[PDB]
Amino acid sequence: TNYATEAMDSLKTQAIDLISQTWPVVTTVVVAGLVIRLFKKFSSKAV
Amino acid sequence: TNYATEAMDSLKTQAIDLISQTWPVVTTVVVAGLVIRLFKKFSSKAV
Amino acid sequence: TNYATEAMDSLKTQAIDLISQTWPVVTTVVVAGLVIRLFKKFSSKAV
Amino acid sequence: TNYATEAMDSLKTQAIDLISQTWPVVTTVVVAGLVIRLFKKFSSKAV
Amino acid sequence: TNYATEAMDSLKTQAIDLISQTWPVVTTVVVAGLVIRLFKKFSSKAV
Amino acid sequence: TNYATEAMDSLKTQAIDLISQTWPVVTTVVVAGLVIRLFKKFSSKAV
Amino acid sequence: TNYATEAMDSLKTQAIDLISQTWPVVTTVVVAGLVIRLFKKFSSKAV
Amino acid sequence: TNYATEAMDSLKTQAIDLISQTWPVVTTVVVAGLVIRLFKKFSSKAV
Amino acid sequence: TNYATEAMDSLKTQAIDLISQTWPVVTTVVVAGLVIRLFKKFSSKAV
Amino acid sequence: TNYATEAMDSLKTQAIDLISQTWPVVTTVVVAGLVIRLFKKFSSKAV
Amino acid sequence: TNYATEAMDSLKTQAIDLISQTWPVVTTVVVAGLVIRLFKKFSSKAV
Amino acid sequence: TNYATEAMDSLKTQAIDLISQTWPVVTTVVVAGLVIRLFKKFSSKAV
Amino acid sequence: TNYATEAMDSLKTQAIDLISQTWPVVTTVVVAGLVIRLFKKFSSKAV
Amino acid sequence: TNYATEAMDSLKTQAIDLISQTWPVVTTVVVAGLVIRLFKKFSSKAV
Amino acid sequence: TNYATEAMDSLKTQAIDLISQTWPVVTTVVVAGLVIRLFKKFSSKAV
Amino acid sequence: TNYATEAMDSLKTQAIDLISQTWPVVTTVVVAGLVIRLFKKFSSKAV
Amino acid sequence: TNYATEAMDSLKTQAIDLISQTWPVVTTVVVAGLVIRLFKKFSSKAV
Amino acid sequence: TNYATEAMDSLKTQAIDLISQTWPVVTTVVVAGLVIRLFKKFSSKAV
Amino acid sequence: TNYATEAMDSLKTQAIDLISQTWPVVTTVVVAGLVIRLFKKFSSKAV
Amino acid sequence: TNYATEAMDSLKTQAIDLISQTWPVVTTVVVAGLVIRLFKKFSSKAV
Amino acid sequence: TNYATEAMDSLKTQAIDLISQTWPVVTTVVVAGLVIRLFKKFSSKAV
Amino acid sequence: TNYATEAMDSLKTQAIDLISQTWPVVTTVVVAGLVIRLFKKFSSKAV
Amino acid sequence: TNYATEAMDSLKTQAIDLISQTWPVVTTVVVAGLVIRLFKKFSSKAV
Amino acid sequence: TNYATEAMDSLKTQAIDLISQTWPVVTTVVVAGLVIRLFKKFSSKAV
Amino acid sequence: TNYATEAMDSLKTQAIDLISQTWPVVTTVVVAGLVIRLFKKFSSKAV
Amino acid sequence: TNYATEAMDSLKTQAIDLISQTWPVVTTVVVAGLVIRLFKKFSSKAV
C-alpha cells in the first residue's frame, strides 16, 4: 500500500542499521577471543 | 436515493480517513515491537 | 372531487416534505452509530 | 331507477377516482418507510 | 395491481441500488481490516 | 353469493399475485444480506 | 409544516449534541482499554 | 346562509386554534420520548 | 377557547413535569446497567 | 416453493463460487508463510 | 439536555474512577508475572 | 458477484505485493544472521 | 472526526511514550544478560 | 314463523358458505406470510 | 377444521421441504470452512 | 440426522485424505533435514 | 345457556385440536433449528 | 407435555448421535497430529 | 320490582355461568401459547 | 381467583417439568463439548 | 360510590393476588434460565 | 339551573373521586409489571 | 400529579434497591471467574 | 420486594454452590496438567 | 443443584479417568526418550 | 462505586495473596532445577 510498503521500508532501514551496529561488537568479541588464543599458542611455541 | 447514496458516500469518506488514520499507530506499534526483537536476536548473535 | 383529490395532494405534499425532513436525522444517527463502531473495530485492530 | 342506479354509478365513479388518488400517498409513505429501514439494515451489514 | 406491482418494482429498484451502494464500504472496511492483519503476520515472519 | 364469492375470488387473485410479486424483493434482500456475510466469513478464513 | 419540520430540527439538534456528548466516553473507554493492552504487549517484549 | 356559513367559519376558527394548541404537546411528548431512546442507544454505543 | 387552550396548557404542564420526573429513573437504570458492564470489561482487562 | 428453493439454489451457487474464489488467497498466504519458514530452517541447517 | 449531558458526565466520572481503580491490579499482576520470569532468566544465567 | 470476486481479487493483489515486499526484509535479516555465524565458525577454524 | 482523530492522536501519544518508557528496561535486562555471558566466556578464555 | 325461520335458515346458509369461501384466502395469506419468515430464519441459520 | 388442519399440513410440508433445502448450504459452508482450517493446521504440522 | 451424520462423514473423509496427503511433505522435510545432519556428523567423524 | 355453554365447548374443542395440530410444526422447526446449530458447534469442536 | 418432553427426547437423541459421530473425526485429527509430532521428536532423538 | 330485580338476578346468573365457562378456554389458549414459547426458549438454552 | 391462580399453578408445573427436562440435554452437550477439549489438551500434554 | 369504589377495591385485590401469584413463575423461569447459563460459563472456565 | 349545574357538580365530584380511586390500581399494576422486567434485565446483567 | 410522581418515586425506590441487590451476585460471579483464571495463569508461571 | 430480593438470594445461593462445585474440577485438571509437565522437566533434568 | 453439581461430578469423573489414562503415554514417551539419551551418553563414555 | 471499587479491592487482595502463594513453588522448582545442574557441573569439574 501507501502504508504497508512504507512500513516495510521503515523496518528494513531499522534492521540494516541495527546489523551494521552489531558488527563492531562481533569483531571486538571474536577477534579479542582469538588473540587471547594465539597468545597461548605461540607462547607455548616460544618455549 | 438523493439521501441514502449521499449517506453511504459520507460513511465511506469517514471510513477511509479513519483507516488512513489508524495505519500510523499500526506501524509504530508493530515496527517498534520488531526492532525490540531484532535487538535481542542480534545481541545474542553478537556474543 | 374538487376537494378530495386536492386534499390528497395536500396530504402527499405534507408527507413527502416530512420524509425529506426525517432523512437527515436518520443519517446523523445511523452514521454516527457506525463510526462509533468502526472506531472500536479498528482501534482493536491497531493493537 | 332512473335516479338510484344513476346515483350509484356516480358514487362508484367518485370512489374509484378517490382510490386511484389515494394509492400515490400509500406508495410514497410505505416505500419511503422501507428504504429508511433497508438503509439501516445494509448500513449495519456494511460494518 | 397497477399500483402495488409498480410499488414493489420501485422498492426493488431502491433496494438493488442500495446494495450496490453498500458493497464499496464493505470492501474498503474488510480488505483494509485484512491488510492490517497480513502486515502483522508477515512482519512477524520477517523477523 | 353471486357477488360475495366473486369478491373473495377477486381478493384471492389479488393476494396471490401480490405474494408472487413480493418474493423477488425477499430473495434480493436476504441473499444479498447473506453473501455480504459469507464474504466476511471466508475473507477472515482466507487469512 | 410550521410544526413538524421545526420538530425534526429540534430532534436533530438533540441528537447531534447527544452524539458529541457520547464521543468522550467512547474515547476514554476504548483508549484506556488499549493502553492497558499495549502495556501488556510491550511489557512482555521488555523481558 | 347568513348564519350557517358564519357558523362554519366560527367552527373552523375554533378547530385551527385547537390544532395549533395541540402541536406543542405532541412535540414535547414525542421528542422527549425519542431523546429518552437516543440516550439508551448511544449510551450502549458508548460502552 | 377559554377552556380548550387552558386544557392543553394544563396537559402540557402535566406532561413536562412527568418527563422531568421520568429522567432520574432512566439515568439510574441505564448508568447502573453500564457500570455493571464496564466493570466486567475492565476486570477482564485487568487479568 | 417456486421461489424459496430457487433462492437457496441461488445462495448455494453464490457460496460455492465464493469459496472457490477464497482458496487461492489461502494457498498464497499459507504456502508463502511456510516457505519463509523452511528457508529459515534449512538455512540454519546449512551452517 | 439538562439531564442527558449530566448523565454522560456522571457516566464519565464513573468510568475514569473505575479505570484508575483497575490500574493497580494490572501493575501487580503484570509486574509480578515478569519478576517471576526475570528470576528464571537470571537464575539460569547465574549457573 | 460483480463486487465480491472483485473484492477478493483486490485482496489477493494486496497480499501478493505485501509478500513480495516482505521477502527483502527476510533475506537481509536471515543472511546477515548467518554471515555473523559463519564468521565465528571460520574464525575459530582459522586458529 | 473532531473526536475520533483526536482520540487516535491521544492513543498514539500514549503508545509512543509507553515504548520510550519500555526501552530502558529492555536495555538493562538484555545488556546485563549479555555481560553476565561475556564474563563467563572471557573468564574461561583467561584460564 | 313460516317466514322468519326460513329467513334465518337462508341467512345461515349464506353465512356458512361465506366462511368456507373466506378460509382459502386466510390460508394463502397466513401460510405465505409464514413461509416468507421461515425462509429468513433458516437462511440466517444456514450461514 | 376442514381448512385449518389442512392449512397446518400445508405449512408443515412447506417447512420440511425448506429445511431439507437448507441443509446442503449448511454442509457446503461449514465443511468448506473446516477444510480451510484443517489445511492450515496440518500445513503447519508439515513443517 | 440424514444430513448431519452424512456431513461428518464427508468431513472425516476430507480430513483423512488431507492427512495422508500431508505425510509425504513431512517425510521429505524431516528426513532431508536429518540426512543433512548425519552428513555433517559422519563427515566430522571421517577426519 | 343451552346454546352459549355449548358454543364455548365447541370453541374449546376447536382450540385444543388446533394446539395439538400446531405442536408438530413447532417441534420440527425448533429441533431442526437446533440440530443445525449443534452441528456447527461440534464440527468446530472436531477441529 | 405430551409434545414438549417428546421434543426434548428427540433433541437429545439427535445430539448424542451427533456427538458419537463427531468423535471419530476428533481422534483421526488429534492422533494424526500427534504422531506427526512424535515422529519429529524421535527422529531428532535418532540422530 | 317483582320483575325487574328478578330479571337482573337472572341476567347475573347467566353472566357468572358464562364467565366460568369462558375461563377454561382462556387457560387452554394462554398456557398452551406459553409452553410453546418456553419450549423455544429452553431449547435454545439447551444448545 | 379460583381460575387464575389455578392457571398459574398449572403454568408453573408445566415450566418446572420443562426445565427438569432440559437439563439432561444441557449436560450431555456441555460435558461432551468439554471432554472433547480435555482430550485435545492432555493429548498435547502427552507429547 | 358505594359500588364503584367497592368495585375498584375488588379489582385491586384481584390484581395484587394475581401479581403475587405470577412472581413464583417468573423466578423459576428466570433463575433456571440463568443457572443453565452459569453452568455453561463455569464449565468452559473449568477446562 | 338550580338543578342542572348542581347535577354537573355532583357528576364532577363523582368522577374525581373515581379517578383518585383508580390511580392506586394503575400504580400497583404498572410498577409491578416493571419490577418484574427490571428483575429479568438485571438478572441477565448479573451473569 | 399527586399519584404519578409518587408512582415514579415508588418505581425508583424499587429499582435502586434492586440494583443494590444485584451487585453482590455480579461480584461473586465475576471475581470468582477471575480468580479461577489467575490460578491457571500463575500456576503455569509456577512451572 | 418480598419476591425479587428472595429471588436474588436464591440465585446467589445457587451460584456460590455452583462455584464451590466447580473448583475441584479446576484443581484436578490444572494440577494434573502441571505434574505431567514437571515430570517431563525433571526427567529431562535427570539425564 | 440436583443437576449442576451432578454435572460437575460427572465432569470430574471424566477428567480424572482421562488423566490416569494419559499418564502411561507420558511415561512411555518420556522414559523412552531418555533411555535413548542415556545410551548415547554411556556409549560415548564406553569409548 | 460503592460496589465496583470494593470489588476491585477484593480482586486485588485475591491476586496478591495468590502471587505470594505461587512464589514458594517457583523457588522450589527453579532452585532445585539449578542445584541439580550445579551438581553435574562441579562433579564434572571434580574429575
Next chain:
Amino acid sequence: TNYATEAMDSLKTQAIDLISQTWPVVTTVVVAGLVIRLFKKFSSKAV
C-alpha cells in the same frame, strides 16, 4: 469414554511401534559412530 480411551489406546499403539521403529536407526548411527572411533583409537595404539 468408549471413544477417548480407545483413542488413547490407538495413540499408544502408534507410539510404541514408532519407538520400536526408531531404535534400529539409533543403533546403526551410534554403533557406526563408535566403531569409527575405536578404529582410530586402536590404530593409533597399533603404531
Next chain:
Amino acid sequence: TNYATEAMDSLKTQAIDLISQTWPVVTTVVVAGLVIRLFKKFSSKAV
C-alpha cells in the same frame, strides 16, 4: 481462596516429592558416569 491456595499447596507437595524422587536417578547416573571416567584416567596413570 479456600481452594486455590489448597491447590497450590497440593501442587507444591507433589513437586517436592517428585524432586526428592528424581535425585537418586541423578546420583546413580552422574556418579556412575564419573567412576567410569576415573577408572580410565587412573588406569592410564597406572601404566
Next chain:
Amino acid sequence: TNYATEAMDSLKTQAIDLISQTWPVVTTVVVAGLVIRLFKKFSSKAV
C-alpha cells in the same frame, strides 16, 4: 480437494527445490571446514 492437494503439491515442490538449493552451501561449508583441518593434521604430520 481440488485446492488443498494442489496446495500441498505446490508446497512440496517449493520444499524440494529449497533443499536442493541448500545442499551446495552445506558442502562448501563442511568440506571447506574439513580441508582446513586436514591441512593442520597433515602439516603437523609433515614435521
Next chain:
Amino acid sequence: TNYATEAMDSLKTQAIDLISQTWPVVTTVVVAGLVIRLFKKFSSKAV
C-alpha cells in the same frame, strides 16, 4: 501515564535489584570453577 510509567519504573527497580542480586552467585560459581582448574593446571606444572 500516571500508572504505566510508574509501573515501568517499578519493574526496572525490580530488575536492577534482581541483577545485582544475581552477580554474587555468578562470581562464586565461575571463580570457584576456575580456581578448581588453575589448581589442576599448576599442580601438573609442579611435577
